[PDB]
Amino acid sequence: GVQVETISPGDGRTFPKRGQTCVVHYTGMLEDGKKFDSSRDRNKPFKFMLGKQEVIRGWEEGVAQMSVGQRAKLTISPDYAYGATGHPGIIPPHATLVFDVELLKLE
Amino acid sequence: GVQVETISPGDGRTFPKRGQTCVVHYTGMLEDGKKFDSSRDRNKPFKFMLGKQEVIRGWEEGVAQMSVGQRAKLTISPDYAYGATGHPGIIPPHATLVFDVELLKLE
Ligand SMILES: C=CC[C@@H]1/C=C(\C)C[C@H](C)C[C@H](OC)[C@H]2O[C@@](O)(C(=O)C(=O)N3CCCC[C@H]3C(=O)O[C@H](/C(C)=C/[C@@H]3CC[C@@H](O)[C@H](OC)C3)[C@H](C)[C@@H](O)CC1=O)[C@H](C)C[C@@H]2OC
Numbered sequence: 001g002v003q004v005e006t007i008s009p010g011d012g013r014t015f016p017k018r019g020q021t022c023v024v025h026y027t028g029m030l031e032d033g034k035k036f037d038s039s040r041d042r043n044k045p046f047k048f049m050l051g052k053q054e055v056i057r058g059w060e061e062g063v064a065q066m067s068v069g070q071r072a073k074l075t076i077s078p079d080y081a082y083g084a085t086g087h088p089g090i091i092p093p094h095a096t097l098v099f100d101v102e103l104l105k106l107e
Numbered sequence: 108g109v110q111v112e113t114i115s116p117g118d119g120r121t122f123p124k125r126g127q128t129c130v131v132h133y134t135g136m137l138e139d140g141k142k143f144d145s146s147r148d149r150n151k152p153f154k155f156m157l158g159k160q161e162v163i164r165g166w167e168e169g170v171a172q173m174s175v176g177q178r179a180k181l182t183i184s185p186d187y188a189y190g191a192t193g194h195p196g197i198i199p200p201h202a203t204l205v206f207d208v209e210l211l212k213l214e
């Protein structure tokens with residue numbers, strides 16, 4: 001599934017609802033910390049909506065547990081990410097992924 | 108994983124090697140037989156290579172067990188396909204997929 005470990009607390013009040021746009025900054029890394037992607041490096045937040053199969057399930061269920069302003073590490077098992085296939089040229093088969101996610105706002 | 112059940116036998120001699128192009132016709136369906144895609148409908152075989160994360164793992168391991176001319180049903184568990192996420196707008200979360208695959212040739 002997904003484990004959510006908090007780096008900095010959110011407002012403890014505003015949690016994402018299906019049909020809102022979540023605006024986040026993320027860094028994705030393998031379990032040993034190797035970075036494969038980050039929106040912080042592009043200086044451009046990533047936006048997505050819950051309920052539309054727009055993100056891997058680990059994100060759909062991890063970000064729904066965060067409130068605005070929170071920064072958390074989401075550790076996602078392979079079945080909630082790219083499974084036995086991986087993602088071509090970036091993520092190996094059976095990889096647990098770690099995302100450092102900051103939920104900046106909801107629109 | 109993947110289960111391979113044969114509809115028509117292949118030559119029992121020529122099995123796909125990494126670095127060959129497999130030329131196939133396929134029909135993909137959910138477990139109840141609902142069709143979501145077929146190359147047969149486009150009259151255009153699908154081609155791919157083993158060893159390059161070009162296909163879901165269930166195909167990488169299922170087609171490697173088929174010889175040329177064989178037609179088989181590959182039943183693939185979600186972790187060897189799209190897992191808990193599914194494929195946006197086409198495949199639901201946690202879906203076992205069934206592919207009717209004919210291995211036409213290797214190039
Ligand atoms: C339409 C095509 C381009 C479109 C691309 C963008 C909007 C740019 C957006 C910043 C993606 C990044 O581009 C630099 C890059 O992000 C990664 O590096 C990454 O960190 C990651 O894992 N992310 C991104 C952050 C949200 C979680 C997760 C995701 O959910 O990503 C989603 C993902 C790949 C889901 C697949 C969908 C197919 C399902 O079958 C499968 O289910 C198993 C899961 C992305 C958002 C797709 O919905 C949308 C796209 O693909 C991937 C390693 C590869 C991906 O490039 C493609």
Ligand SMILES: C=CC[C@@H]1/C=C(\C)C[C@H](C)C[C@H](OC)[C@H]2O[C@@](O)(C(=O)C(=O)N3CCCC[C@H]3C(=O)O[C@H](/C(C)=C/[C@@H]3CC[C@@H](O)[C@H](OC)C3)[C@H](C)[C@@H](O)CC1=O)[C@H](C)C[C@@H]2OC
Nearest residue numbers: 082085086087088135144153161162163166188189194197
């Ligand atoms: C570059 C972009 C376009 C590029 C599209 C084509 C060459 C056209 C090709 C006929 C695809 C079909 O287009 C009508 C259509 O085929 C399906 O309908 C389908 O029957 C299927 O399941 N197939 C196709 C037959 C081989 C097995 C499997 C697959 O392995 O498909 C692969 C797949 C989606 C793998 C993801 C890759 C990301 C990993 O993270 C994830 O790992 C969990 C698995 C396809 C071949 C990709 O490698 C290449 C592409 O995407 C999918 C339901 C959705 C897919 O449309 C996209």
